Amino acid sequence: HWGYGKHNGPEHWHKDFPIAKGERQSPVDIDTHTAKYDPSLKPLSVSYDQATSLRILNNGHAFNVEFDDSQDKAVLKGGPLDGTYRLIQFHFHWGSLDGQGSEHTVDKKKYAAELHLVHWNTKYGDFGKAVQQPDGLAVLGIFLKVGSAKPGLQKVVDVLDSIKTKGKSADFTNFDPRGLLPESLDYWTYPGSLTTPPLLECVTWIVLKEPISVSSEQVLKFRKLNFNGEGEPEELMVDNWRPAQPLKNRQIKASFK
Ligand SMILES: COc1ccc2c(CC(=O)Nc3ccc(S(N)(=O)=O)cc3)cc(=O)oc2c1
Ligand SMILES: [Zn+2]
């Protein structure tokens, strides 16, 4: 089965998932000098006031904080987007060291980790239908750099001991994702894909220019997690990031000068 190790990591994925070598794969390096300002881009509209989190799950590749997406409660609109995209879950990708861990890079710079808030286009009715559509998803990507702690992340880091191994889940209600956002909503946008198998090309990527700062102790607790199930040999969950993919025939647009 796919993973992030020597024998099953991102160089191997194309054998099970040939779209790995497709025309709109993610992540990508964001070349800040080549991204064009697009003044017709609208401001991003993040409406998380009514977000309802339910649960947090170690799925063996990362941990997801899932939300109740059966009504329009936490939506992303505007920016490059047409219509309404509903929050379904967020997760992170992170490194074994502070020097690496993000999927997207900026002028080849790697951040310590990267947050992905995953939303689906409500005109497709459900997340499973949306992933099959070229404009099915909108993922908001936020870089994390190590410095001062992010207080709004701490509730997430503290529950990690209860989901150490693959398949473990834990109630996680009343978590407010607004506490994970940076001050600015300036962003780059391009068309891409899920960054893990099945690597479907269904994502409008929106990656915020401003990273959030998290403490070394916060990111250290991410690295205590396990890719394996309980009672299997311990492999730390670290370096669960796919490296930058060829941009090919795509332009990255900036929302800002
Ligand atoms: C029927 O419902 C579902 C629920 C989950 C998935 C999933 C699981 C999933 O959601 N993957 C996923 C989500 C987000 C990402 S990323 N790293 O690009 O933000 C990378 C991978 C994939 C899929 O094809 O069909 C599904 C259908
Ligand atoms: Zn992700």
GROMACS .gro file of C-alpha atoms in nm, residues 53-179:
model
  127
   53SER     CA    1  -1.600   1.987   1.442
   54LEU     CA    2  -1.682   1.627   1.532
   55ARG     CA    3  -1.377   1.407   1.556
   56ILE     CA    4  -1.010   1.367   1.500
   57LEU     CA    5  -0.867   1.063   1.323
   58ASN     CA    6  -0.521   0.920   1.261
   59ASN     CA    7  -0.574   0.760   0.917
   60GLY     CA    8  -0.220   0.627   0.889
   61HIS     CA    9  -0.095   0.915   0.661
   62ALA     CA   10  -0.183   1.222   0.868
   63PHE     CA   11  -0.450   1.321   1.124
   64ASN     CA   12  -0.781   1.478   1.016
   65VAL     CA   13  -1.006   1.704   1.220
   66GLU     CA   14  -1.343   1.638   1.056
   67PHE     CA   15  -1.643   1.869   1.048
   68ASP     CA   16  -2.017   1.827   1.005
   69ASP     CA   17  -2.061   1.919   0.639
   70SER     CA   18  -2.433   1.822   0.610
   71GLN     CA   19  -2.529   2.194   0.612
   72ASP     CA   20  -2.365   2.519   0.502
   73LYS     CA   21  -2.185   2.610   0.822
   74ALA     CA   22  -1.817   2.662   0.741
   75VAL     CA   23  -1.774   2.773   0.382
   76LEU     CA   24  -1.507   2.921   0.155
   77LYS     CA   25  -1.628   3.153  -0.127
   78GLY     CA   26  -1.485   3.427  -0.347
   79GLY     CA   27  -1.122   3.447  -0.444
   80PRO     CA   28  -1.086   3.241  -0.766
   81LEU     CA   29  -1.390   3.036  -0.675
   82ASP     CA   30  -1.735   3.026  -0.834
   83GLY     CA   31  -1.992   2.912  -0.585
   84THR     CA   32  -1.974   2.772  -0.238
   85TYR     CA   33  -1.726   2.524  -0.096
   86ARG     CA   34  -1.799   2.350   0.233
   87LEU     CA   35  -1.531   2.261   0.494
   88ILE     CA   36  -1.507   1.884   0.546
   89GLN     CA   37  -1.178   1.838   0.726
   90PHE     CA   38  -0.836   1.982   0.788
   91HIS     CA   39  -0.498   1.809   0.830
   92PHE     CA   40  -0.128   1.890   0.815
   93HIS     CA   41   0.187   1.756   0.648
   94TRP     CA   42   0.510   1.798   0.843
   95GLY     CA   43   0.873   1.708   0.856
   96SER     CA   44   1.126   1.517   1.064
   97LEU     CA   45   1.313   1.846   1.102
   98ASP     CA   46   1.201   2.212   1.108
   99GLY     CA   47   1.380   2.256   0.775
  100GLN     CA   48   1.126   2.058   0.577
  101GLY     CA   49   0.769   1.937   0.589
  102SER     CA   50   0.561   2.161   0.362
  103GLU     CA   51   0.427   2.031   0.030
  104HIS     CA   52   0.419   2.361  -0.159
  105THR     CA   53   0.740   2.557  -0.150
  106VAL     CA   54   0.795   2.929  -0.208
  107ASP     CA   55   1.098   3.011  -0.426
  108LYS     CA   56   1.211   2.659  -0.325
  109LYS     CA   57   1.178   2.735   0.047
  110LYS     CA   58   1.035   2.450   0.257
  111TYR     CA   59   0.831   2.531   0.568
  112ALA     CA   60   0.820   2.319   0.886
  113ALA     CA   61   0.468   2.196   0.802
  114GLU     CA   62   0.162   2.288   0.596
  115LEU     CA   63  -0.207   2.302   0.695
  116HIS     CA   64  -0.475   2.198   0.439
  117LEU     CA   65  -0.835   2.299   0.501
  118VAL     CA   66  -1.030   2.085   0.253
  119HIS     CA   67  -1.363   2.211   0.112
  120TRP     CA   68  -1.596   2.068  -0.155
  121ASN     CA   69  -1.818   2.241  -0.414
  122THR     CA   70  -2.172   2.210  -0.284
  123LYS     CA   71  -2.309   2.196  -0.642
  124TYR     CA   72  -2.185   1.837  -0.656
  125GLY     CA   73  -2.391   1.734  -0.351
  126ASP     CA   74  -2.126   1.534  -0.159
  127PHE     CA   75  -1.750   1.508  -0.121
  128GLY     CA   76  -1.730   1.178  -0.307
  129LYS     CA   77  -1.896   1.324  -0.618
  130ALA     CA   78  -1.690   1.649  -0.595
  131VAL     CA   79  -1.350   1.470  -0.612
  132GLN     CA   80  -1.453   1.344  -0.954
  133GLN     CA   81  -1.493   1.703  -1.083
  134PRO     CA   82  -1.215   1.932  -1.212
  135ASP     CA   83  -1.352   2.210  -0.986
  136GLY     CA   84  -1.468   1.971  -0.711
  137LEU     CA   85  -1.249   2.091  -0.430
  138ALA     CA   86  -1.090   2.403  -0.287
  139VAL     CA   87  -0.802   2.342  -0.047
  140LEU     CA   88  -0.674   2.639   0.161
  141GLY     CA   89  -0.304   2.577   0.231
  142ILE     CA   90  -0.128   2.765   0.515
  143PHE     CA   91   0.243   2.736   0.589
  144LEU     CA   92   0.368   2.678   0.940
  145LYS     CA   93   0.711   2.811   1.053
  146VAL     CA   94   0.866   2.732   1.390
  147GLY     CA   95   0.878   3.021   1.639
  148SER     CA   96   0.612   3.149   1.882
  149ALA     CA   97   0.331   2.907   1.971
  150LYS     CA   98  -0.004   2.921   1.796
  151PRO     CA   99  -0.251   2.916   2.085
  152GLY     CA  100  -0.545   2.800   1.869
  153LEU     CA  101  -0.352   2.486   1.770
  154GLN     CA  102  -0.288   2.368   2.122
  155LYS     CA  103  -0.623   2.190   2.162
  156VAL     CA  104  -0.525   1.985   1.856
  157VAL     CA  105  -0.176   1.904   1.985
  158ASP     CA  106  -0.308   1.800   2.326
  159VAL     CA  107  -0.547   1.533   2.191
  160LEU     CA  108  -0.277   1.370   1.974
  161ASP     CA  109  -0.182   1.127   2.258
  162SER     CA  110  -0.525   0.970   2.227
  163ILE     CA  111  -0.484   0.899   1.847
  164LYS     CA  112  -0.120   0.789   1.837
  165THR     CA  113  -0.172   0.502   1.592
  166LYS     CA  114  -0.346   0.439   1.258
  167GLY     CA  115  -0.724   0.391   1.289
  168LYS     CA  116  -0.757   0.561   1.629
  169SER     CA  117  -1.016   0.838   1.651
  170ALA     CA  118  -1.132   1.067   1.928
  171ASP     CA  119  -1.428   1.297   1.983
  172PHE     CA  120  -1.318   1.651   1.905
  173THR     CA  121  -1.610   1.891   1.922
  174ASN     CA  122  -1.620   2.276   1.942
  175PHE     CA  123  -1.281   2.326   1.776
  176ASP     CA  124  -1.269   2.666   1.606
  177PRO     CA  125  -1.053   2.659   1.287
  178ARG     CA  126  -1.043   3.042   1.285
  179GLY     CA  127  -0.771   3.014   1.547
   0.00000   0.00000   0.00000
